[PDB]
Amino acid sequence: APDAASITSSIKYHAEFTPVFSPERFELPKAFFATAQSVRDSLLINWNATYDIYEKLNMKQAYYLSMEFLQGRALLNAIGNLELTGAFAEALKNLGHNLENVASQEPDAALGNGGLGRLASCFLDSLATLNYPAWGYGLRYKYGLFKQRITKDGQEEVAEDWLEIGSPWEVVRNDVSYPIKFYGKVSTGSDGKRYWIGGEDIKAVAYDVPIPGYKTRTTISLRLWSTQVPSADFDLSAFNAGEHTKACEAQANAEKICYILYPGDESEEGKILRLKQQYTLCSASLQDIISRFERRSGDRIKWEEFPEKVAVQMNDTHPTLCIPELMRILIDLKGLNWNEAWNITQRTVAYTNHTVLPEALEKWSYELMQKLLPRHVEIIEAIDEELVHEIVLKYGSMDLNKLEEKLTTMRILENFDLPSSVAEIPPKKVRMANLCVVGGHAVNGVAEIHSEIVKEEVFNDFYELWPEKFQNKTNGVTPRRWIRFCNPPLSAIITKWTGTEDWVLKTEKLAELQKFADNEDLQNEWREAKRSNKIKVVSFLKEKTGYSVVPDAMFDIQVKRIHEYKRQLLNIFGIVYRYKKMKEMTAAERKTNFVPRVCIFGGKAFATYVQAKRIVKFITDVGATINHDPEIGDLLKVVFVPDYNVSVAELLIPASDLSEHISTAGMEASGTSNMKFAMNGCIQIGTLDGANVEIREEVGEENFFLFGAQAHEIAGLRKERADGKFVPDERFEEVKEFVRSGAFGSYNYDDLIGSLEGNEGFGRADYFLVGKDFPSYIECQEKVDEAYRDQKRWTTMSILNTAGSYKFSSDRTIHEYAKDIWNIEAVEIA
Amino acid sequence: APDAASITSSIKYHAEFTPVFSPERFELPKAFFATAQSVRDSLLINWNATYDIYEKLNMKQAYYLSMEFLQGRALLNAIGNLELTGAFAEALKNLGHNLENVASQEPDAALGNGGLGRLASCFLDSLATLNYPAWGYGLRYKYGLFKQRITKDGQEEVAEDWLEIGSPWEVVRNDVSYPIKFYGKVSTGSDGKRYWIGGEDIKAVAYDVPIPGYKTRTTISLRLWSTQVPSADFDLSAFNAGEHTKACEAQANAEKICYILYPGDESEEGKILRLKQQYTLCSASLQDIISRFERRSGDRIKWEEFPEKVAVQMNDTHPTLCIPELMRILIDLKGLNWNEAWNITQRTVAYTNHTVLPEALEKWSYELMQKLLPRHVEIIEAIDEELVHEIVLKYGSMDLNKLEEKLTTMRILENFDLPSSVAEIPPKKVRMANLCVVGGHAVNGVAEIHSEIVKEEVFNDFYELWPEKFQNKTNGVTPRRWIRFCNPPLSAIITKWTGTEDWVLKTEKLAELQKFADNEDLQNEWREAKRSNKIKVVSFLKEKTGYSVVPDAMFDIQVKRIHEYKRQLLNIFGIVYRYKKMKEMTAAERKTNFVPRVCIFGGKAFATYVQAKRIVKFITDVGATINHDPEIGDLLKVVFVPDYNVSVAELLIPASDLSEHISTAGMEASGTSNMKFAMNGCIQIGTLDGANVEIREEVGEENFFLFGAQAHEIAGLRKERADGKFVPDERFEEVKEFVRSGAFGSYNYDDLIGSLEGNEGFGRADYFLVGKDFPSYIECQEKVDEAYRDQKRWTTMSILNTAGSYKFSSDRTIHEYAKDIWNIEAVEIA
């Protein structure tokens, strides 16, 4: 039970005796490392305790596979969950530092990109807090995706430095390395088994990141794979020769698998790298899982017990190769027979779907996949046949015309021949999505409506064939990271008013705030807290954007991936309109119609996506103009926060008044940031999509600004534009014109406005219905502006957003996956 | 004052809480790391204590710069010098390991190649043991030079794996990184100073290896540089594009500087890499030294005090660039004037020469050096002028004919114009050797005769000009590593007979063994010890060479770089003759004429040197034949030990009866292995060269087998061969014929014997006088064979070799450098 003085000793040791800097003085970077190593000392104890019980008990374990994890900063949650935030703060006090300054030294772990990763992370927090035996598997990416600079010219991208010094959190396990093979060829032995030989050979080495549960000892693992090759493979002959580049090739080719996340896949080179990434994750992970299976199994090792001991969850279609790979292992290596293996596979593997549109789902060149993972392609053709035969088995051959339809939809191989078939240069592809539906026992969506969409549109025929497969698992975020730790003031209020502090665990108690949403004491507290958080942000904003804003404005935040479909363009247009109106007013006329705002944008544009990058450039200029216009002062500010990541979100979210979730209706599957915002009392303006629907429902429609056409309406509305039956609002034109006037400086925005004009053509014709939804939007913003004036109302809406949150705790989501998909029971780590 | 139980705790912590392997079980690799980290815990204490006193006292510090350090294994010497070998052995006992098994897990640190490096290492041991404030600077090479496999085909080379897991000994100092610049161009500012801009920019990051003194706290540093480039330089644009190779280029180009040691320099590519290595060492090191100077200097920072506070020692001509670089810094950066700077430079920098022949000394393409380090080339031309003018100043212009001679010899630029000169496409080069003689206050050789040779041949005119420069500093080896630790049995005897244990420090007490060299008790001990060591080797030999040898033979060892001039060819020829004779004898005729031998060869052949590699292949075959010939049994064994390195030498040397040092007379500068052997009571057969001369003198000519033509005689003897006035012995032909007979199997040795035939031609005509010296050699071996029969004699020769050693302690050598070159006084670390 370590106290502050003990921890002081702890920090001092690691500072001197496990050092990574010169001995002189205790600067901040040194202090961080020492603190982190110190914390890890504890994580390792519990990691071991857990690891041991899991080995000895040999219960069923679950394995979450994801290409991305968005872990962000570890320090505060680690000490938080351990319940030592007090002792550590004190310990750093005596060492002449303060906790928040130390903690802000730590880079965000750049292991993920979007909500896909952040889901995975939250899940691990829950999995561990709830004592459920489960691990994550992922790649250990060196340079993340990219770090975002915002420059005069817009967005520039640069490689993440997170590992420049190295991560004090991770643990290398040198004795955990597996062989991964690419390319090469297959043959048959005289035992009649298949042999996959030749190609390229590389290792995959495990790195463990401990994940401590909240108020428990259960400490699980995010095990990350780093690809490499033994030093022997360095070609001394070539190097001494003079061909330095050439000598390195072997190792360069192996390590690049782990360099960056979603590498550019325009090139054939990129696509291959992608496959190599995917395969590496699956192969390495499965090998490790199986190894552990056997190990725990002693002598009485039975392969029919496998699915009762192991569950693999494929987070989206990237870990698709788990299905063929596990077959391969169970057949070629463990020497079971096909049905045995396939039954084991299906009862192990489950699929989680994340996409609404059947084209977001990934497809691979037959030629290319077959050339890289030849033994897999075999196993895939096999399953494609078996499937074809079972489609034929049901339905019958009476309909012919309809059976022809069902094959072309449901078949894993696209543009292939059937094997034997009554029938009386289009490229050959592999539909990974289809493969995932076939090989898994479960296919889940991530939100009521989305799960419905997979059942009834995306995987239509499949649902008819095997309904018992399809499910929903509505997404969530951990209340640990997203309330308890990121928002200390709100936490204090919540604890006060709900009586206990159990709400961090038993998050339903948030609902008890309901009764008090009028209470004017609680409102006064709540506003003090929300202000206090904004104060911090003002400082941040200065340091990062160079812009001094006032805390006494509405914080109007849209932070997410800078895409046309997310319609940053909409929000900023709305902002443009507000500004134009302001400029054509008297000074106290301005005051009257507009509440003071700070409109906060953040998020990353795909490096190569010319429009998205133009959008970012626009927002910065709009800002530049508005912020330095003296006619506007503090009535409106526009900032673009550079390099939005977990840590940024941990800072903006607690301090937000309004969050924008304004995608073209129906196009989002779930969302997670909305859940996070709601939890902190932020009110949401948005369209009816994803979990906007479910949040709105649960917080109450009176505490959520809704606007714009709904999902159903979209088909028709494009139709309309294409027929020339759309009439733009004249306020919409007013903006477009105003931009064209060179109003935001001398950068030319012709091309940008171009995407919003015409009735056809790939980039033209406002396909994302910004002009359409624009009236309802600015209209809805009026309502907002008004509700902000009625502070007693606004504060109730706030409080109720929080009180509605509890169902979006990832604890709930994990309890569900655990009981309705994996089937694992909580293991106590005494 | 840590005891065994404390150390047990220590090992257990580092095992669990600073781990590098899975938690399960305490295997040997895990045990090593934990022990090493444990040891380092202590090294770091003393490293800091030292570092601190050195900062506070601000006395003069010395900096030894070498391209190679041959540190070998650290564990046993670390615990040895700390005096904890007892506690650690016990601690590992309780953890269920034994010390020697643990210690044999540790790779040799692959930071050096030959004696040049091993000198440097020994020096550090002394420097630290003697409390002299001094550090080493070197590059941190990833893959060493190469690891040697011995295969059926001979020698194969492969990249060193020493860092695959990483080194538990080293300490990264992230806040110690310096800029290194290559290429680019120079200009003049309006301040009239020179500006070197553009080119390539890379970092150099310090890694510290603590070096603990014996029975002291003085723990100094071997600071190693690793070259890299910030992550920002990774080209995301290129990577996502698809040109993976291209994106990496920046970082690949920077890191390769530290990949391997003496990279192949056939190519222009290789030569540039070499220069980059050299420069990196000098620049990084000087920057660090100066930084520390300034830091200690506070306010009263005076650049005329510099040489009184700093001495740089250039180990051979590689760190030559220190001279121009230090000028550059003192001028362009610190803004002194030329004379001020040049005076500071000279009074700082000293040269150590290692070569006998004026062509072993390195020369650089003007074009290439000027293109890479343009600002240096300037400074070099400057010095070349100043020199030219001072040559002219003395001597006068009266002789013309002779002044013309003195310029072409002494000038740093080869094939250049004089500036103003009375005179009434040969490539342009820079003579680094000359530059070193000019810029330094000292030029030393490494052995009496060698130092003489530099004075009177190599740097002839220079000596006349500045005699006060030239010196000698006879080489040495540390009695810590080379007696006290590597030979525990001999150590026990030595302590017994010399009364104290002070002989590890006060190594002159070895001479007291003299009086007892007859004493038959001491002989009995001595032989038991030497046998005990051989026992270990028998085991080793089996495991590595696959050959079971008997301990009850003479151990006849030639371990050094496999070159024609070292004449491995001679020894093996001698071996061939012995074998032929044996085969033409009766069984007890064999017994009568030949003592049982195990002839041990080891050492590395330059990868590309076709003859050297053929030689190695020969020795293995000779072995193969002799070892499995049942007519020979245990009378003769020939083994080639693969991958000779410090650790191997620590094992063979204690167990040796006779060591071979049989270079073509006069060609060696010093040698160190001979010193090591002598110390362990090994008797030496050798030619009169290097320190063979000085060892022979000191142990006594009656305890050293000498043979073959002397230095003076060599010129004449080549002359003779070239005139066709050489007559080969018919025993020499007997061997050649015997080989040609296909006697050693079916590999063809025509080309090999070829080098030994003819009177001219580059590879032909036995230029190394193997045939010449062959009679005296085999003759001398007879004497040996005989003296081995007279065990009382043999054991006295042994004992006296040890008693003669004391003067070859590197303590002596360092005391001398310290007082007669650097001028530093012992600093007590209370």
Residue numbers in the entry:
A (entry chain A), B (entry chain A): 23 to 446, 511 to 916
Describing publication, verbatim:
Starch phosphorylase (EC 2.4.1.1, α-d-glucosyl transferase; SP) catalyzes the reversible conversion of starch and inorganic phosphate into glucose-1-phosphate (Glc-1-P), playing an important role in starch metabolism in plants. S. tuberosum phosphorylase is the first starch phosphorylase discovered3−5 and has served as a model SP for biochemical studies of plant phosphorylases. The most significant structural difference between the Pho1 and Pho2 forms is a 78-residue-long peptide insertion in the middle of Pho1, termed the L78 segment. The stPho1ΔL78 structure reveals that activation of the enzyme occurs through the proteolytic degradation of the L78 segment and the association of the two remaining protein segments to form the active enzyme.
